[PDB]
Each structure stands twice: as structure tokens, then as C-alpha cells.
């Protein structure tokens, strides 16, 4: 078997990094449990590589996860930070909270999209064995 999950993730100015955690009993992998860090572009790399593999003609290939969009929150944030003398006391705290809620919503959506993609692959008889998928899970 081959179980994949994303237990944490990090939003920076220009990228989103996901921790990709694998547990497997399969002998092809270097070890039975490991974790790597991947950006969204690595998932798109994986998806496009699979789509372009001619031996996979006829196979259902799961759709790529959506591009995370933190642009709104991040800015509100970058400013609320520049506005340390911005009416808080309290308001700064209140605005930090509302913005955290906005980040949590985007994280929940995008972690779910990224994780479901990997899980669909893990269960695919052919794609689960793909060498590029293995690189994606193990490269560190």
C-alpha cells in the first residue's frame, strides 16, 4: 500500500511549500516512511509529465491541483503589519484574527486539492508506480 498526506504547509510571498508525507510497504521506495517539501509547481510538473507519457494513453489521470491564491490575505497582512500603529491596541489584533481566518480558508482549500491529487495517484494501479511520481515523493 501507499498512503500520502500533507500535514503542514507554508505560505511565503512568492510560493507555497507543502510537506508531503508518505508511508509505504512497497520495495521500490528507499524507505517505508519519509517526508519531502514540494511547491505547487512540482505538482504541476508531475501532472504534466504524466499527461505527456505516451504509455498512459487511455488512462484516467487525475486533474492537477489548483494554484493557491493567497494574494488577498497576503497584502492585507503585509499592510496590517506596516500598520503597527494602526488603532490597535485591539483593532490590529482583531484584523490579525480576521486575516488568519482568511489564510486558514485558502490553506484548507489548497491543501485539500493538493492532497487529493496525490491520493488519487497513490491508488492508481499504473500511476502509483510511475518513476516521476516516485521522484516527486522521495527527492530531497
Amino acid at each position: 500500500s501507499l498512503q500520502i498526506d500533507i500535514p503542514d504547509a507554508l505560505s511565503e510571498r512568492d510560493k507555497v511549500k507543502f510537506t508531503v508525507h508518505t508511508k509505504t510497504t512497497l520495495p521500490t521506495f528507499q524507505s517505508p516512511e519519509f517526508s519531502v517539501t514540494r511547491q505547487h509547481e512540482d505538482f504541476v510538473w508531475l501532472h504534466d509529465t504524466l499527461i505527456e507519457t505516451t504509455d498512459y494513453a487511455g488512462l484516467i489521470i487525475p486533474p492537477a491541483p489548483t494554484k493557491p491564491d493567497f494574494d488577498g490575505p497576503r497584502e492585507k497582512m503585509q499592510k496590517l503589519g506596516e500598520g503597527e500603529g494602526s488603532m490597535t491596541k485591539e483593532e490590529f489584533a482583531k484584523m490579525k484574527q480576521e486575516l488568519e481566518a482568511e489564510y486558514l480558508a485558502v490553506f484548507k482549500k489548497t491543501v485539500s486539492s493538493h492532497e487529493v491529487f496525490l491520493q488519487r495517484l497513490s491508488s492508481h494501479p499504473v500511476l502509483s508506480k510511475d518513476r516521476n511520481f516516485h521522484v516527486f515523493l522521495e527527492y530531497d
Binding site: 500535514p7 503542514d8 504547509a9 505560505s11 489564510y103
Partner: peptide, 20 residues
């Protein structure tokens, strides 16, 4: 930067605004 932790053993994803 904002760090996300998926919730563990009952409870509750969390987010923290990263600081140094």
C-alpha cells in the same frame, strides 16, 4: 509568511503568522 498545521488528534487546523 504564514505556517499552516493540519489538526492532530481531535481538533482543529491552525495558522500562525511567522515571526523571527
Amino acid at each position: 509568511a504564514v505556517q499552516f498545521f493540519k489538526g492532530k488528534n481531535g481538533s482543529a487546523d491552525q495558522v500562525i503568522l511567522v515571526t523571527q
